[PDB]
């Protein structure tokens, strides 16, 4: 599902929508689940390069992947609480295209560095168009789907969370990648009991040797 | 007939004709220690073709065809009777049946 290894360099990009449709009530839940995810993934001792971008119409850049201190979990997790839902008050758009273009610019330069994208948007977007164009551009940047012998499909894994009251599932499903036997979309009701979504989020291909891990999903 | 006894019947006593998506219980009666295989097919498949379907009659026909004798009793003489019945009778005195060298009579 995800690349999880302290010996490898991974990139995780966090993007938050500033749309007025979601409201602050779900924005707090999104912030809480993002904090839970960063705390959980950082608990394995890995230090991936992070980044935060909050957008409503013009994508504000908070944390850049090129920052030397960006690998610190503490810096990112205390920048998480710094942002608020009321920051994007002048602009109330849902320009997903501009935000993904900003992510493209941030990720503009490597061939062995796994990239992970996680997104939170209700899907209903007024400004911009279909994010598929920027997704295809980013896919072509890493040379994905260009060689019949080296597909390199495990380097770019995009995730989306359907946080919001009125959500259109068609574009949410379209935006998320559809891989073999993997899930990439989730629901608001996952704020409580983050362990359920987290179990899909993190896999142990080689992390079983170490110790200091525990699962709390009620399903088992 | 079967050497054992395999019977399939519905668990529900009378009830009503089963509705699609509704459960039902099958009661299979057979000799202990035997492994049972099952298969269920729509009858349209059979109306469209019903040739070479597996059944007990075919099994017994194959077994009967694979016999060794092909004369319903009696014969020309003792050697002929024994050969037709599908055996060989050899004695220290010298009596013997007719030699057989063909698989199919």
């Amino acid at each position: 599902k995800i690349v999880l290894d302290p010996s490898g360099s991974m990139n995780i990009y966090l993007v938050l929508d500033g749309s007025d449709s979601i409201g602050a009530s779900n924005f707090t839940g999104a912030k809480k689940c993002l904090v839970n995810l960063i705390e959980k993934v950082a608990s394995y001792g890995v230090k991936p390069r992070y980044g935060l971008v909050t957008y409503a119409t013009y994508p504000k850049i908070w944390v850049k992947v090129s920052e030397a201190d960006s690998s610190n979990a503490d810096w990112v997790t205390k920048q998480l609480n710094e942002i608020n839902y009321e920051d994007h008050k002048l602009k109330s758009g849902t320009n997903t295209k501009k935000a993904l273009q900003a992510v493209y610019s941030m990720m503009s330069w490597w061939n062995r560095t796994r990239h992970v994208i996680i997104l939170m948007t209700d899907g209903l977007h007024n400004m911009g168009g279909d994010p598929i164009t920027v997704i295809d551009e980013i896919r072509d940047l890493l040379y994905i789907g260009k060689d019949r012998k080296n597909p390199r499909e495990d380097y770019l894994d995009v995730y989306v969370f359907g946080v919001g009251p009125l959500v259109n599932q068609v574009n949410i499903n379209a935006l998320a990648s559809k891989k073999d036997n993997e899930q990439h979309v989730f629901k608001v009701k996952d704020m409580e009991n983050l362990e359920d979504v987290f179990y899909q989020m993190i896999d142990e291909s080689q992390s079983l040797s170490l110790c200091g891990m525990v699962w709390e999903h009620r399903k088992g | 007939s079967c050497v054992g006894s395999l019977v399939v019947k519905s668990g529900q006593s009378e009830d009503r004709q089963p509705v699609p998506g509704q459960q039902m219980t099958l009661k299979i009666e057979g000799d202990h220690g035997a492994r049972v295989v099952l298969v269920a097919v729509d009858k349209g498949v059979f109306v469209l073709n019903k040739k070479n379907k597996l059944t007990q009659s075919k099994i017994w026909d194959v077994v009967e065809k694979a016999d060794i004798g092909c004369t319903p009793g009696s014969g020309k003489d003792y050697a002929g009777v024994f050969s037709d019945a599908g055996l060989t009778f050899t004695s220290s005195s010298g009596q013997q049946t007719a030699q057989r060298a063909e698989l199919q009579c």
């Binding site: - | 050497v3 097919v41 009858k43 349209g44 498949v45 109306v47 469209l48 073709n49 070479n52």
Partner: protein, 214 residues
């Protein structure tokens, strides 16, 4: 060896599941090795497998997927024991274009023969019913053909359009039609031949038709 296939017709692109039973001359489960071959109607083996009936009580489940580009006809499954490759056992399915019909059609003549001097003539009873135990309404088509070995001769003047009511109907072939259909008016020459009935049943709705032949 008893080859059991779940169905008898398989659409292209659909998998086939067949179980191979292994028994001895005393009809008991045996542990041996079974060679399996699948032969297309023109006689070209396509997929060959090796198995062993050890630790399965003489049951060897198997599967195969039919490719999209195949020649429809009479496919064959061939199996034989390792020690006796000459003894080949057979069981044949077929691949065809079909959609499942919604009703059986049974043609049951009153007597399983036709007396040559019977002036009444052959009588055919059509009994069509839905698969799920309900009667059918519609119209039927009957044509009587004379089969002489591999040679089939049709009778254009025996085509009769009978209406089927409550899953029942009847049609009669007058002896004059049988005599005049063949060029030879002789009677004794017809002894030794055979007849067939090609009944087509059509719903009042026109949903589909089923060609049932005896």
């Amino acid at each position: 060896l008893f080859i059991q296939t779940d169905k008898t017709i398989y659409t292209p692109g659909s998998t086939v599941l067949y179980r191979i039973f292994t028994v001895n001359h005393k009809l008991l489960p045996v542990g041996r090795t079974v060679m399996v071959n699948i032969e297309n109607p023109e006689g070209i083996p396509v997929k060959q497998d090796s198995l062993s009936s050890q630790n399965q009580l003489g049951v060897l489940p198997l599967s195969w997927d039919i490719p999209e580009l195949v020649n429809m006809g009479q496919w064959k499954i061939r199996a034989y024991y390792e020690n006796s490759p000459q003894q080949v056992f057979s069981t044949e399915f077929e691949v065809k274009e079909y959609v499942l019909p919604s009703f059986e059609v049974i043609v049951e003549p009153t007597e399983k023969f036709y007396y040559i001097y019977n002036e009444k003539g052959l009588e055919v009873t059509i009994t069509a019913r839905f698969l799920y135990g309900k009667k059918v309404e519609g119209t039927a088509f009957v044509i009587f053909g004379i089969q002489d070995g591999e040679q089939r001769i049709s009778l254009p003047e025996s085509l009769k359009r009978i209406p089927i009511e409550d899953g029942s109907g009847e049609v009669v072939l007058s002896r004059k039609v049988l005599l005049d259909g063949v060029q030879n008016p002789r009677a004794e020459d017809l002894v030794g031949k055979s007849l067939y009935v090609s009944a087509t049943v059509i719903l009042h709705s026109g949903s589909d038709m089923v060609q049932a032949e005896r």
